[PDB]
Amino acid sequence: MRVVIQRVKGAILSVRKLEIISEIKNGLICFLGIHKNDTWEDALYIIRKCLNLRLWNNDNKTWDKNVKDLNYELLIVSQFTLFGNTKKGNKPDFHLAKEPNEALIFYNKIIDEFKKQYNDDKIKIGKFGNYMNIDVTNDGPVTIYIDTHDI
Amino acid sequence: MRVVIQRVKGAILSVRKLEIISEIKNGLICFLGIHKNDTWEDALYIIRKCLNLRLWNNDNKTWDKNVKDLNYELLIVSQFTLFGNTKKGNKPDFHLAKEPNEALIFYNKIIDEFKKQYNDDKIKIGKFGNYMNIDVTNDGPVTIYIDTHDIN
Ligand SMILES: NCC(=O)N[C@H]1[C@@H](O)[C@H](n2cnc3c(N)ncnc32)O[C@@H]1CO
Ligand SMILES: NCC(=O)N[C@H]1[C@@H](O)[C@H](n2cnc3c(N)ncnc32)O[C@@H]1CO
């Protein structure tokens, strides 16, 4: 499983009816990619990293507060393009991405778990399998990458 | 070298005078991280992929046009946080980043090479070593990740 985590001041997510369906204020936007062989343990790792990663400062020191400490939000967005393999040519190859129908069911379980480990109000999502327009205010910017297959 | 590429309809980047210092319309925002071990060839790989990756559709086929074909822009944003190591705990560790002063010089060369391979009016940047506020309209979204240390 792969994620790209960006720290934001706000993010506005729109799709065709454009029409807003999701917004957060301060927090994290997480672009989430599900590998065909991802397991539930891969998901858990991403969930707790997303929720406990210390991407904000204290007055005292840097990198010392996470999203929960600040009561901030998370906008989780499905991104199959993280498995866009560009090693062979300039046409990205998406072979490694779990196929959409299963990846949907897996995605919804992950969202369910994000909520259980934090709060229903705090987890926003996109619209899986649709075109999305996302207005983000990148705060830094801060951008973090995790691939669970590295452990 | 590490890069996160995102396809955008627009991006306004501002810093403390916060005033606007860079703006693009349709194109790519590239979050660019320099490893302490990167050589000029790491850079060349990244530049090539950024400029040539086919992240837009043609009328009759997907993943078939690059930023150049469409005459679109790129906003290049320096990002040491891409080496945020989180294997050990929940405090990210950034030791793999190239040291800032040398990194700026490297970064500046990369930007110039970007200007070379495309058009200096279509290449735009942020403010290395400074807090930046970037208003991005993500178009898709479409996010690509490349670590040169996985390749060659
Ligand atoms: N361009 C925006 C977009 O990525 N759209 C993707 C995802 O929202 C979703 N999707 C399908 N498979 C996956 C997967 N393995 N992981 C994450 N999302 C998936 O289905 C869309 C087209 O495949
Ligand atoms: N928060 C946004 C940010 O990351 N700002 C970084 C980069 O703009 C730049 N910088 C320093 N070292 C590097 C490096 N090794 N690679 C890329 N950029 C660097 O210096 C800022 C603080 O170190």
Author numbering:
A (entry chain A): 1 to 17, 27 to 160
B (entry chain B): 1 to 17, 27 to 161
Give the published text.
One key molecule in this process is an enzyme named D-aminoacyl-tRNA deacylase (DTD), which hydrolyses D-amino acids attached to tRNA molecules (a D-aminoacyl-tRNA). Here, we show that besides acting on D-aminoacyl-tRNA, DTD also efficiently hydrolyses the achiral glycine attached to tRNA—glycyl-tRNA(Gly)—as DTD’s active site pocket cannot discriminate between D-amino acids and glycine.
We solved the co-crystal structure of PfDTD with Gly3AA at 2.1 Å resolution in P21 space group. However, it is important to note that the carbonyl oxygen of glycine is rigidly fixed by a DTD fold-specific interaction with main chain N of Phe89 and by its interaction with Nε of Gln88. Thus, the flexibility in glycine was observed only for its α-NH2 group. Consequently, we placed the α-NH2 group in the flipped orientation in all eight monomers before the final round of refinement. In contrast, it prefers majorly the position occupied by the Cβ in D-Tyr3AA complexes, clearly showing a lack of strong selection of the amino group in the opposite orientation.
